[PDB]
Structures are given as structure tokens and as C-alpha cells.
Amino acid sequence: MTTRMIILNGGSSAGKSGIVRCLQSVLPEPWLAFGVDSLIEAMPLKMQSAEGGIEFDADGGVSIGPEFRALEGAWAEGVVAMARAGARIIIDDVFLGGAAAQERWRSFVGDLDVLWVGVRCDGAVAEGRETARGDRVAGMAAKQAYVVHEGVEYDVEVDTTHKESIECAWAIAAHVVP
Amino acid sequence: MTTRMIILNGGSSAGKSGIVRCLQSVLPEPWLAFGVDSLIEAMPLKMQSAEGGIEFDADGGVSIGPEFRALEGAWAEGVVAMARAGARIIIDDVFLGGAAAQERWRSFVGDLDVLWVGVRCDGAVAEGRETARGDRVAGMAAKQAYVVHEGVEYDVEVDTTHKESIECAWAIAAHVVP
Amino acid sequence: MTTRMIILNGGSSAGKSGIVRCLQSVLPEPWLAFGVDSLIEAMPLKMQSAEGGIEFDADGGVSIGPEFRALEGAWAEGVVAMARAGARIIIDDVFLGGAAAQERWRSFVGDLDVLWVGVRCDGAVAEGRETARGDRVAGMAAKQAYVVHEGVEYDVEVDTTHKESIECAWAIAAHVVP
Amino acid sequence: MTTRMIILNGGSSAGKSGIVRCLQSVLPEPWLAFGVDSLIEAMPLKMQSAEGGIEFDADGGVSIGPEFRALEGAWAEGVVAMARAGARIIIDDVFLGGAAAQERWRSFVGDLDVLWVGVRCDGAVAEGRETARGDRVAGMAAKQAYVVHEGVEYDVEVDTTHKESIECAWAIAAHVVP
Ligand SMILES: Nc1ccc([C@@H](O)[C@@H](CO)NC(=O)C(Cl)Cl)cc1
Numbered sequence: 198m199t200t201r202m203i204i205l206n207g208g209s210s211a212g213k214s215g216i217v218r219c220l221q222s223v224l225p226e227p228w229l230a231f232g233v234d235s236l237i238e239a240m241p242l243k244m245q246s247a248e249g250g251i252e253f254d255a256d257g258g259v260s261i262g263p264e265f266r267a268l269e270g271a272w273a274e275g276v277v278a279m280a281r282a283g284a285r286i287i288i289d290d291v292f293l294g295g296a297a298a299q300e301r302w303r304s305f306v307g308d309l310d311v312l313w314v315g316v317r318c319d320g321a322v323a324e325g326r327e328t329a330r331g332d333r334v335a336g337m338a339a340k341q342a343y344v345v346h347e348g349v350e351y352d353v354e355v356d357t358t359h360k361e362s363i364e365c366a367w368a369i370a371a372h373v374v375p
Numbered sequence: 376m377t378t379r380m381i382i383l384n385g386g387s388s389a390g391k392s393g394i395v396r397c398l399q400s401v402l403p404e405p406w407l408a409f410g411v412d413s414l415i416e417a418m419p420l421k422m423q424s425a426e427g428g429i430e431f432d433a434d435g436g437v438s439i440g441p442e443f444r445a446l447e448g449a450w451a452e453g454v455v456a457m458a459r460a461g462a463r464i465i466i467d468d469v470f471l472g473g474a475a476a477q478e479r480w481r482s483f484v485g486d487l488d489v490l491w492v493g494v495r496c497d498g499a500v501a502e503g504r505e506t507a508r509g510d511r512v513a514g515m516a517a518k519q520a521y522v523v524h525e526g527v528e529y530d531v532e533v534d535t536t537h538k539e540s541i542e543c544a545w546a547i548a549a550h551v552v553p
Numbered sequence: 554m555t556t557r558m559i560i561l562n563g564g565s566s567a568g569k570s571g572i573v574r575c576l577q578s579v580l581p582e583p584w585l586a587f588g589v590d591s592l593i594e595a596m597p598l599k600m601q602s603a604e605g606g607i608e609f610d611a612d613g614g615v616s617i618g619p620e621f622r623a624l625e626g627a628w629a630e631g632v633v634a635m636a637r638a639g640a641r642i643i644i645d646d647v648f649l650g651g652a653a654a655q656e657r658w659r660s661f662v663g664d665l666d667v668l669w670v671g672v673r674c675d676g677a678v679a680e681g682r683e684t685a686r687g688d689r690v691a692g693m694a695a696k697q698a699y700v701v702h703e704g705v706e707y708d709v710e711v712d713t714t715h716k717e718s719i720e721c722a723w724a725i726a727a728h729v730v731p
Numbered sequence: 732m733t734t735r736m737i738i739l740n741g742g743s744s745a746g747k748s749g750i751v752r753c754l755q756s757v758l759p760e761p762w763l764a765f766g767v768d769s770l771i772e773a774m775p776l777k778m779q780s781a782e783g784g785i786e787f788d789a790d791g792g793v794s795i796g797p798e799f800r801a802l803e804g805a806w807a808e809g810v811v812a813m814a815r816a817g818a819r820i821i822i823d824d825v826f827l828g829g830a831a832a833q834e835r836w837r838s839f840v841g842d843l844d845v846l847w848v849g850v851r852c853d854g855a856v857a858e859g860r861e862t863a864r865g866d867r868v869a870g871m872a873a874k875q876a877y878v879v880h881e882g883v884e885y886d887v888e889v890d891t892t893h894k895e896s897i898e899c900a901w902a903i904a905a906h907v908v909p
Pocket residue numbers: 207208209210211212213214232233234259289291292293337338
């Protein structure tokens with residue numbers, strides 16, 4: 198019943214990264230972090246616009262091709278395999294496909310003990326943060342603030358609109374079975 | 376016989392990262408990159424000095440505790456699992472333990488089709504690059520330039536002392552069975 | 554009476570950078586940003602521990618030698634000269650010496666039209682953010698949260714404890730005479 | 732006759748940044764570095780595509796509007812003022828307008844003791860490095876490799892095609908009058 202993998206889902210600028218860094222600092226056992234950003238980084242730069250692999254519209258839009266989806270699948274199985282091997286894994290993703298994305302993750306996780314965390318934040322508030330962070334593709338924060346959660350089932354839900362990262366980290370840590 | 380995982384070993388500032396970015400650009404199929412640096416990043420910051428996890432001496436020295444070694448093991452199995460799942464994986468590491476480190480990797484890779492690449496660079500030349508890159512822990516380049524290769528068996532060997540990254544990438548790509 | 558230079562002072566993690574990026578986005582005329590961080594970057598790496606130039610104690614402490622102070626002076630005169638030349642300049646610093654630091658700045662600014670902004674944030678809250686940002690030298694946020702303001706006179710004061718960056722940017726922009 | 736400001740000009744990926752970091756490490760007196768990149772950073776993000784301020788064509792092309800040119804002028808006068816104030820200033824720029832750009836700089840420098848350095852690199856070789864560095868706007872290295880030097884007069888010329896950064900730093904330091 199001991200928790201093997203923590204999986205956070207949230208729109209862009211919702212505050213995921215900062216919670217993950219806080220969780221790593223809060224939790225006593227060492228946890229490895231692997232978000233969707235670290236995946237994008239492990240992919241070839243060409244994979245980044247050359248269709249088949251992710252493409253950002255000037256209006257903060259994101260579209261995923263099959264080339265990308267195939268790589269993402271292999272990666273998913275790798276992190277799950279890390280958990281299964283005994284490592285503690287935190288993963289922050291952006292369920293663009295709502296429940297569909299969660300189903301996709303469930304198929305990989307199998308029967309592993311997972312904590313499904315939901316990170317919410319006000320669309321307008323998240324967009325302001327997008328601006329303060331210096332993000333390039335402006336428009337995402339607002340576009341993803343609500344849709345990414347549709348039909349997604351969580352075990353915990355934090356809202357970073359009025360709560361700090363270190364605080365949402367505490368609410369989440371309390372649901373982690375050692 | 377098709378190559379599943381490429382594994383580069385080399386001292387610090389030997390030029391590994393740049394070859395990896397070149398390989399990703401050169402090779403036709405998308406390859407995921409996961410070096411030891413990306414691992415360090417996935418670990419909690421505390422894990423970075425609090426004994427048990429990696430510690431950098433002021434003289435460019437590096438020591439690895441058991442806490443770290445355990446996490447590294449789980450990670451190793453995860454990337455191998457990614458290959459096994461069908462993803463193409465490039466991995467740049469620093470075999471501080473020479474052959475011992477390679478044996479450790481062999482135990483995880485199993486019977487997977489791997490390309491063992493060796494990236495060499497002149498100790499003094501590598502140290503100059505360490506300085507030009509703005510690295511903080513000065514001293515590593517020179518300390519690791521030769522020892523990391525002792526007793527290590529490669530399928531290919533490039534030397535970045537007089538050859539460019541894009542060029543070493545070409546010599547390496549030519550040994551990749553599609 | 555048109556504002557030539559905006560000068561923010563605040564402890565570490567008080568939120569200065571994000572306000573500066575927001576101001577740049579909010580204000581209609583292009584403003585150049587030059588904090589104390591960009592200065593540290595323009596200095597030689599050796600200047601960073603080799604006494605005479607800034608040194609960070611393991612307890613989040615900071616000490617400035619004369620080598621550093623001399624360079625900082627020349628830099629100060631350069632940014633003022635940029636304003637005088639017609640550029641709009643935002644500057645975020647950390648008045649470690651309270652009023653002393655402000656006097657030091659006044660001597661350089663001369664009779665230039667300046668907006669003295671004060672960015673406050675709860676010491677404990679700022680320290681939590683320090684943790685979420687992944688800062689290395691932990692301890693500064695708390696150590697600087699209050700002292701840096703002692704005896705310092707502001708034209709505006711924002712508190713990022715409960716107000717967002719984009720919001721503090723709005724309160725500040727409203728005091729900028731075009 | 733003591734050198735007050737060092738000014739390097741070179742195409743993208745020609746190796747300028749690394750020489751600058753080497754010079755800072757080599758030269759005994761602390762030198763402040765301020766390239767054109769640090770300027771771009773001090774400007775508002777909007778200033779980065781919204782015409783009037785710099786815009787990168789998908790083919791590695793760069794165009795500068797008047798909004799940008801005005802800010803650049805004020806900045807130029809600021810760094811010169813820093814030198815005049817007694818600071819030692821290194822500046823790496825990209826003379827897109829060949830001699831025109833140098834004339835523009837001469838008008839700001841005045842009678843200050845300046846070292847005009849020229850950093851050359853093979854267009855094809857520079858483009859390979861552009862790829863290994865992970866630069867986004869591919870195409871610049873090749874487009875700027877030669878034109879940026881047309882009609883420009885140097886006091887020193889280094890070629891990074893076959894010489895290392897630390898080495899070009901040594902050839903340049905030897906022309907610096909203390
Ligand atoms: N499906 C998807 C994958 C990656 C991304 C990223 O570009 C980016 C957008 O804000 N995500 C993040 O910063 C997360 Cl850490 Cl919130 C967004 C959406």
C-alpha cells in the first residue's frame with residue numbers, strides 16, 4: 198500500500214514544477230522527478246516543429262502528432278519500470294486529453310500504487326504568472342487551466358490560486374503512504 | 376541486431392553533451408537523451424550535499440554515496456525498460472569506476488543491443504573548455520580525462536581534441552544498425 | 554517630471570524579478586532591466602569567491618569586499634548614464650546596508666527623476682519560495698526579508714505576501730510619470 | 732594608453748562568449764562583460780517580435796527596427812560611461828552592418844582607449860557548432876560568418892576554426908595595455 202508514484206496534472210503555469218521541487222524537499226525518502234518538460238528535452242530539437250512531434254501555435258496552442266506519441270509511450274513505460282525497480286517517482290504532466298490522457302497513463306501504471314494529484318489554478322491568475330515567468334508561448338496558461346481536468350479523477354486536489362507551493366506540497370505529502 | 380541504446384562515456388568537458396545533441400540531429404529516427412546530468416536534476420536538491428548523495432570537493436573531486444547509488448540503479452533499469460519498450464535511447468555517463476561502472480551498466484542492459492562509445496579529450500584541453508563553459512567546479516575535466524576509460528571496452532572511440540562534435544557524431548552514427 | 558529610472562529594493566525571493574518582467578510587459582515604452590544579478594553575471598567567475606568579490610556563507614549569508622564595491626560603482630554610473638542618454642531603466646537591487654545603500658545610490662542618480670519602490674514579503678513566506686525556486690544558497694530569503702528596508706525611504710511599497718506580481722506591477726506602473 | 736574597453740565582433744557561434752569568459756579568467760583586473768545578448772535580455776519580451784524591436788526569420792535571419800536601435804544607443808552610452816567611470820568593459824557584438832556598425836560604435840566610444848578584436852570562424856564550422864549548442868534559430872552562424880567583418884578594422888584578429896577559446900583569449904590578452 199506504500200505509494201510508488203505521484204502523478205500531478207495541471208495546466209501550464211498552474212504551479213506544478215514548484216510543488217514538485219517542494220515535495221522533493223519535504224518527503225524524507227529521495228524522489229526522482231520527471232515531468233513532460235524533461236521528456237521534451239530528451240527529444241531531438243527537430244522533433245519540436247517538424248510535424249509528427251509537438252507544435253506550439255502562436256496563440257498558446259499545442260498539438261501532438263504520432264511520432265511524439267510513440268516516444269512518449271516508451272518513456273512512460275520507462276518511468277513506471279523505475280518505480281517497479283524500487284525508485285520513488287514524481288511525474289508532472291498536462292492531460293490535454295482530460296480523462297483520455299489519464300486512461301493512457303493507467304494502462305502503463307498497471308497495478309502500481311499511485312497518487313493522482315490535481316493542481317488547479319485560476320485561468321486568469323495562471324496567465325499572469327505565465328507573464329511573470331517570462332514564458333515564450335503566451336496563451337497556454339489560460340487555454341489549459343480548466344480543460345485538462347475534465348473527467349479526470351484525483352486522490353488529492355490542491356488549488357494554487359490562493360495557496361503557496363510549499364503548502365500544497367504539505368497537503369500532498371500527507372497522502373503519501375511510506 | 377538493430378541498435379537499441381547508445382552509451383557514451385567520457386570525462387567532464389570531454390564534449391559528450393554536444394555529440395549527443397548532434398546525434399539527435401543526425402540520426403533519422405527520434406532518439407531520447409538521458410545523461411547523468413538529467414539524473415542529478417531529477418533528484419532532490421538536498422540529495423546533492425547531504426551525504427549519501429553526490430558531493431563535489433573544491434578541487435574538482437566527486438564522491439558517490441549509497442543513497443545515490445540506489446536511486447541510480449532504479450533509473451538505469453528505467454531507461455533500459457524504455458529501450459525494451461521500443462524507444463531509442465542515448466546515454467552519456469562518466470564511468471568514475473572505469474570497468475566497474477561498465478560492468479554495473481552491463482548488468483542492467485542485459486542482452487539489449489548496445490553501442491559502447493568512448494569520448495576522449497586531452498586533459499589540459501578539456502580543462503580549458505571547462506573554463507570557457509563557465510563550469511563551477513573547476514578541476515574535474517583534468518581529474519577525469521583519463522581514469523574514466525581504464526579497462527573500459529568500446530565499440531567506437533572518438534577523440535574531441537582535434538575533431539568537432541558534428542564530426543564525432545558522424546563517426547558514431549555510422550556504427551548504428553537501424 | 555517624467556520618470557527616468559525605477560529602483561526596486563527587496564530581500565531575496567521577495568519577488569523582484571517577476572515584478573520587473575511584469576513592468577516591462579505593462580509599461581508602454583520599452584524599459585531596460587539591470588538587476589544586481591545581471592551585474593554578478595558580468596563579473597569574472599573568480600571574482601565570485603576569491604575575497605575582494607562577493608562570498609556566500611553556507612547559512613545564506615552574503616559579504617561584499619572592496620574589489621566588488623569598486624566595480625559596482627562604475628556599473629551604477631553606467632546605468633545612470635543610460636537613463637541620462639534617454640533610455641528607461643528599471644533596477645532591482647538588495648540594499649544589504651539599508652539606508653547606507655540608498656545613500657550610495659542617491660550619490661550616483663544625482664537629480665535624475667527616480668521612483669523608489671520597496672518590495673516586501675514575509676520572511677517565512679519568502680523562504681518557502683526560495684525552496685520552490687530551487688535556489689542554492691538557502692537561508693537568504695529569511696535573512697534579508699526585513700533588514701534591507703531599515704531606514705530606506707520609498708515612493709511606493711508593494712507587499713508580495715498576498716498580492717501577485719502582475720498586481721504589484723500595476724500599483725507601481727500607476728506612479729510612473731510618462 | 733591603458734586599455735579601457737575590449738570590443739569583439741563576430742558572427743553567431745563564432746565563439747565570442749567563450750573567449751569573453753576566458754578573458755575574464757585570464758586578465759588580472761576584473762572585467763565586466765556586456766554583450767548584445769545581455770541587452771536583448773534587458774529589453775521587454777514584447778520588444779522581441781512586435782516590430783520596431785528585433786525579429787528572427789525562420790531562415791536564421793535578423794532585422795533591427797528603430798525602437799530597438801534607440802534603446803541600443805542609450806545602452807551603448809551607458810557601458811562607455813562605465814569605462815569612463817573606471818570599470819573595465821568587454822563587449823561582444825555582431826556587426827550586422829559591417830563598417831557602419833563600427834562607425835556607430837566609434838561615435839559612442841569617443842576617444843576612449845579601445846581594443847577592436849575580430850573573431851572569425853568558418854561558416855560551415857560555425858554552423859556545426861550552432862547545431863551542437865542547441866541554438867533555436869538555425870541558419871544564423873552561416874549567414875553572419877563573413878559579412879559582419881566587411882570593412883571593419885581590427886587591432887587583433889583571432890580565428891576559432893582551429894584555435895581553442897582559451898588560446899584566442901591569450902592572443903587577445905597580450906594586446907591589453909594595463
Ligand atoms: N501536453 C503538454 C506538454 C508540455 C507542455 C509545456 O509546454 C508547458 C506549458 O506550460 N508545461 C509546463 O510548464 C508544466 Cl510544468 Cl505546467 C504543455 C502541454
